[PDB]
Design a protein around this ligand. Structure first.
Ligand SMILES: Nc1ncnc2c1ncn2[C@@H]1O[C@H](COP(=O)(O)OP(=O)(O)OP(=O)(O)O)[C@@H](O)[C@H]1O
Ligand SMILES: Nc1ncnc2c1ncn2[C@@H]1O[C@H](COP(=O)(O)OP(=O)(O)OP(=O)(O)O)[C@@H](O)[C@H]1O
Ligand SMILES: [Mg+2]
Ligand SMILES: [Mg+2]
Ligand SMILES: [Zn+2]
Lengths: 564, 562
């Protein structure tokens, strides 16, 4: 419960206090109602059964208060469970766009996927499904044992002793099954990742003949997941045997003390018979704890994953904002350094862009051109050195102001699963249709609307799967142009377009009426046409820069890069 | 369900045995309370001590026997279910290996995961728990109620009130939540896809709209709204069932009916012992199947979904039944009905001849490679490799005969040696290293910290040009009689592009090649240039022949220079 209390909203801790008080009142009423059978039946079995009425009235009040208290405990458990669901899920949704890009290792992406995948009714019903019966079962025999002290002192301690072995069984059963339950989760999460990779990479796997379960990696993960789940079923046998022994040990102790007292005359026979029924109520929580103990292990893993997402290191930010909106800003690097893990990408970049001009970044593949665009756009951040937009640090800039400053065309166009217009409109959802058509027309997406049957309502697949490579490239380019931001970064807008679509799109990157400081990335001389200055980057630093004809005349690495 | 009983036919004998065993186990679990009723009755009657000990010890021992039996029965049944799921998931992974590839594009990876993993897991209650809980919830209430009806009908008929209230609540809960249960897997499918798109399209989210305007957040709010509407009245009925069926509730109603009967002369207190002992044990049995109907409803739907995929068409290897000669003949193809992407493509590819496929974007030049791979079956015409039809060839023979590079460098989570040796996982490191050296990626691999063992999952990815060259190394190591290249070296710089093309030509000098490229300057070496426009072959010839003809190829060549 300690982990679950971390995720509770601070605004909702009054409900938790109200919940914990009602849960205790649930147990105390249940135990009192059970132990109220000892004087009730003793009076009922006596020569004057009318004395049973007083204890029946106390039983009725204790039970009716139980129904009211248990309904309220359910209502608070539902509200707390769904309050934790909504706040934790929303906090993950708010945090994850600000989480560092380095956080998304393939293990963390699995954890984030499983954490988001916990949104179903299982996590939302956590407090009602697991926590309420677990606290009820854990404290019910303890409460009955305390309530038995009012009838007979040693009889109560015998019941309390039975609780001690139960909690010992609960502690031991969890320990025995812990290691196998952890391994089962690892293989079940790995198998999840392989199915998603299996479906997402069918063409390559089929061509490689690595698609059959006897030869596939998803098949191996299934085989591992089967053995991990079988050993878990074996390693929970000790836990089930231990709870059975605990129930029998407590049964022997309870029954042994009842007969021991009844032999002496210290306990009437009707009280002894009433204690057989209370003994049945005593032993019911012993079985319920055994049924819920495995669930407690899995839920601990679930919340640990959710807490892992909420513990992810977020990007640095600030509160600065640029002076005016949609003013073409200057962009400069000041000894910017960056590395993926230990692999250094950029090792001393320093340049300046004029406000409103268009400069073309060029260089070999793997040089770090997209990384330069990432730092300009703010997706990454330097380890040391700083990037300034209009003489204002991006790292100390507001998240929204930095977000509004840049619109980019990515190297690999990723489209969300939806209509073609839905992907374009992501650039500016509140843009009027007139500017939408302008962005579509400039990107030559209007040549896709006539050709495709459904026009802009065409349902794109996962990514841009239902569209060709060039089609998704143009839809991505329309998305970037639609956004009214005054900085436009272009990354491989040519890679999937034919010669006719290439030329129109490249020329349309200038026909954009708005004033912007544009950055173009390509490995093709024709695509860097109209560029005011070329930035040649190689081995993680700007090696050469100038004009297209200037460097070609100079015969530098820029010239050699086109001469092959 | 026809699609459920057909899927669960293999587990016939284990399921009937489970119902038979649970009928005996639950009867064994009610035997101690019958003996404890006799023990209590003898205590009031003053029987001898030895008789009491035999009854008391038998009841206590039978409690241990019932607990051991029930634990053993569920252990065997939970091992049966774990084995069936492994077999069933293996069956699904075999089916998905054979479905037409348009099945995956219209469905996505989130839906596949919900099928293989979550739907098979959704069967767990239906197999492992439905028949035990159903039999337990029929035998024990019927056995107890009939036994108690013999003991005293007045207090026995009063036990029917919480029974009927539980029966009404479960039916109302079942009818109400039936529609929501049907919508649940589709909502989970949508949120699985949106969550996967949220995690996969993070660069787009961070720049275009942020967290607030994201489609994931809107769906996340909508899904939780759906869950609240589904789970609020469901959990409300669920807890009312628990309150009704609790042993404390049963004991209270028994005493409400019993105490006025005992205080009055209408009945002796000794006859309360069957009700106080046996009358409060069948509540948990009823609640077991009451909470279980949602598990059956989800299981039956998941069984229907699983069997439906297993009934899908399969790209059947037909029985109808020059090396490296691929021959398209009057081929037509449609991803969706009524939407032609290929229109009567006749093209023959011979060994030692490089055939270049060019044209405007969206003209269908990747569907041809897909059809040659048999990711999809040609709607009309045929594709013959060495005369034999691809539909008659088996998958192993087909993909041994022809290899592919696919314009989308799909890497798999694992070592880069495992990515390069995807075709032949048994291939050695020297074979892997030589393949990478020809693909101009081996130098990049050496700089990684783990070398060739470096895991290549999400986050640890490579640049666009680097991951493309990895997939070229994969096709180099396959070494198939036919090679196909879908926009290979699209992201490569000119020097690396020239080196990769030189290596490819050197390897496939005497091997059939189908190269697709938008940069026509790299295609000047082609033995034949094939121009595809709107899915129809508009002109075929050499570079100079097409330039002289002055058609679509000449237009593209002129517009290339800008
Ligand atoms: N996620 C990553 N993890 C580790 N290294 C990476 C990652 N992404 C890129 N790199 C490496 O960083 C360097 C630059 O990558 P980047 O994607 O910025 O290059 P680029 O200039 O855009 O290349 P290209 O023209 O091939 O697209 C290369 O060594 C690349 O391998
Ligand atoms: N997976 C798919 N599902 C449905 N339709 C598709 C799919 N892939 C492509 N299409 C449609 O097929 C046509 C283009 O097919 P294809 O992918 O072969 O284009 P292409 O000529 O190779 O493209 P490019 O040169 O831009 O890479 C367009 O109508 C596109 O919508
Ligand atoms: Mg790049
Ligand atoms: Mg293509
Ligand atoms: Zn189970």
């Amino acid at each position: 419960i300690r982990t679950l209390l971390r995720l509770v909203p601070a605004e909702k801790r009054g409900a938790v206090a109200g919940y914990a008080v009602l849960t205790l009142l649930s147990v105390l009423l249940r135990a009192v109602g059970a132990v109220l059978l000892i004087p009730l039946l003793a009076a009922l079995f006596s020569d004057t059964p009318s004395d049973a009425w007083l204890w029946l009235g106390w039983l009725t009040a204790v039970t009716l208060a139980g129904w009211v208290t248990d309904t309220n405990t359910a209502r608070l458990g539902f509200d707390l469970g769904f309050a934790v669901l909504s706040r934790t899920q929303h906090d993950m949704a708010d945090r994850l766009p600000n989480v560092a890009m380095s956080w998304f290792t393939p293990d963390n992406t699995a954890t984030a996927r499983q954490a988001i995948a916990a949104t179903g009714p299982e996590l939302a019903g956590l407090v009602v499904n697991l926590l309420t019966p677990l606290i009820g079962a854990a404290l019910l025999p303890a409460a009955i044992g305390v309530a038995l002290l009012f009838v007979s002192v040693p009889l109560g301690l015998a019941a309390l002793a039975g609780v001690a072995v139960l909690f010992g069984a609960l502690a031991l059963s969890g320990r025995l099954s812990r290691a196998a339950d952890k391994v089962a989760g690892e293989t079940n999460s790995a198998f999840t990742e392989r199915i998603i990779e299996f479906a997402r990479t069918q063409q390559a796997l089929r061509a490689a003949r690595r698609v059959e379960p006897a030869r596939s990696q998803v098949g191996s993960a299934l085989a591992a997941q089967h053995g991990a789940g079988l050993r878990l079923l074996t390693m929970q046998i000790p836990g089930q045997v231990l709870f059975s022994l605990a129930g029998q040990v407590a049964l022997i102790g309870f029954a042994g003390m009842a007969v021991w007292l009844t032999v002496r005359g210290q306990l009437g026979v009707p009280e002894a018979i009433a204690l057989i029924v209370v003994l049945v109520r005593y032993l019911e929580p012993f079985a319920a704890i055994a049924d819920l103990a495995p669930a407690l292990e899995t839920t601990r893993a679930t919340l640990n994953r959710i807490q892992a997402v909420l513990d992810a290191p977020t990007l640095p930010a600030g509160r600065r904002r640029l002076d005016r909106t949609g003013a073409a800003p200057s962009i400069e690097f000041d000894d910017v350094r960056f590395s993926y893990g230990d692999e250094v990408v950029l090792d001393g970049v320093s340049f300046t862009l004029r406000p409103g001009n268009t400069t073309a970044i060029v260089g070999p593949s793997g040089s770090g051109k997209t990384t330069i665009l990432s730092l300009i756009a703010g997706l990454q951040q330097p380890a040391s050195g700083r990037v300034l937009l209009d003489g204002v640090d991006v790292t100390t800039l507001d998240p929204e102001a930095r977000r509004a400053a840049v619109s980019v065309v990515f190297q690999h166009p990723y489209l969300f699963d939806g209509t073609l217009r839905d992907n374009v409109l992501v650039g500016d959802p509140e843009a009027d249709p007139d500017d939408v058509t302008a962005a579509m027309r400039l990107a030559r997406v209007d040549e896709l609307l006539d050709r495709l049957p459904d026009g802009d309502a065409t349902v794109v697949g996962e990514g841009g799967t239902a569209l060709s490579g060039g089609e998704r490239q143009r839809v991505s380019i329309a998305r970037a142009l639609l956004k009214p931001a005054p900085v436009l970064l272009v990354d491989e807008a040519t890679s999937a377009l034919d010669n006719a679509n290439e030329a129109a799109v490249v020329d349309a990157l200038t026909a954009d009426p708005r004033p912007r400081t544009r950055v173009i990335v390509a490995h093709r001389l024709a695509s860097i046409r109209h560029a005011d200055r070329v930035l040649f980057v190689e081995a993680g630093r700007v090696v050469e820069d100038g004009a297209i004809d200037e460097l070609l005349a100079a015969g530098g690495r820029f010239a050699q890069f086109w001469a092959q | 369900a026809e699609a459920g009983s057909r899927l669960l036919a293999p587990l016939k004998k284990p399921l009937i045995v489970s119902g038979v065993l649970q009928a005996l186990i639950t009867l064994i679990e009610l035997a101690p309370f019958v003996l404890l009723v006799e023990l209590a009755r003898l205590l009031l009657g003053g029987a001898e001590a030895e008789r009491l000990w035999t009854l008391g010890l038998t009841a206590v021992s039978l409690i241990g026997l019932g607990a051991v039996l029930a634990a053993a029965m569920t252990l065997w049944l939970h091992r049966v279910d774990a084995r069936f799921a492994h077999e069933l998931r293996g069956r699904l992974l075999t089916k998905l290996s054979r479905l037409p590839l348009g099945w995956f594009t219209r469905r996505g990876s989130a839906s596949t995961k919900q099928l293989v993993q979550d739907d098979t897991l959704a069967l767990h209650y239906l197999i492992t728990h439905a028949i035990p809980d159903a039999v337990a919830a029929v035998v024990a209430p019927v056995a107890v109620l009939v036994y108690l009806f013999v003991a005293d009908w007045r207090v026995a008929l009063v036990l029917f009130i919480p029974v009927l209230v539980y029966l009404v609540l479960m039916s109302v809960m079942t009818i109400q939540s039936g529609s929501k249960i049907a919508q649940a897997p589709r909502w989970a499918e949508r949120m699985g896809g949106e969550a996967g798109a949220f995690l996969e399209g993070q660069p787009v989210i961070r720049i275009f709209g942020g967290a607030a305007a994201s489609r994931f957040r809107r769906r996340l709010d909508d899904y939780i709204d759906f869950l609240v509407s589904w789970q609020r009245p469901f959990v409300g009925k669920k807890t009312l069932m628990d309150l009704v069926t609790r042993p404390a509730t049963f004991l209270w109603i028994i005493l409400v009916a019993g105490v006025p009967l005992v205080v009055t002369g209408r009945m002796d207190p000794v006859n309360l012992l069957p009700f106080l002992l046996l009358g409060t044990t069948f509540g948990a049995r009823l609640l077991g199947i009451g909470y279980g109907l949602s598990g059956i409803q989800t299981g039956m739907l998941a069984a229907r979904r699983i069997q439906t995929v297993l009934d899908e068409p399969e790209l059947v290897v037909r029985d109808r039944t020059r090396p490296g000669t691929v021959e398209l003949d009057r081929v037509s193809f449609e991803y969706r009905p009524g939407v032609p992407v290929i229109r009567d493509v006749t093209l023959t590819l011979r060994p030692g001849t490089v055939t270049a496929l060019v044209g405007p974007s969206g003209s269908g030049k990747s569907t041809l490679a897909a059809l040659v791979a048999r990711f999809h079956d040609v709607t009309q015409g045929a594709i013959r490799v060495d005369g034999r039809d691809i539909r008659t060839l088996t998958a192993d023979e087909l993909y041994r005969r022809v290899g592919f590079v696919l314009q989308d460098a799909q890497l798999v989570h694992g070592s880069v040696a495992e990515n390069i040796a995807l075709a032949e996982p048994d291939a050695g490191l020297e074979r892997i290293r030589t393949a990478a050296r020809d693909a101009q990626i081996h130098d990049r691999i050496t700089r990684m910290p783990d070398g060739y063992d470096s895991v290549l999952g999400a986050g640890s990815a490579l640049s666009g040009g680097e991951r493309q060259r990895v997939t070229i190394a994969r096709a180099i190591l396959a070494d198939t009689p036919v090679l196909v290249l879908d926009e290979a070296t699209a992201f490569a710089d000119p020097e690396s592009e020239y080196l990769v093309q030189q290596a490819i030509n050197r390897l496939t000098r005497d091997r059939t090649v189908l190269v697709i490229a938008h940069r026509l300057h790299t295609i000047t070496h082609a033995d034949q240039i094939v121009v595809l426009d709107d899915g129809r072959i508009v002109e075929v010839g050499t570079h100079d022949e097409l330039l002289a003809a002055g058609g679509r190829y000449r237009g593209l060549w002129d517009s290339g220079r800008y």
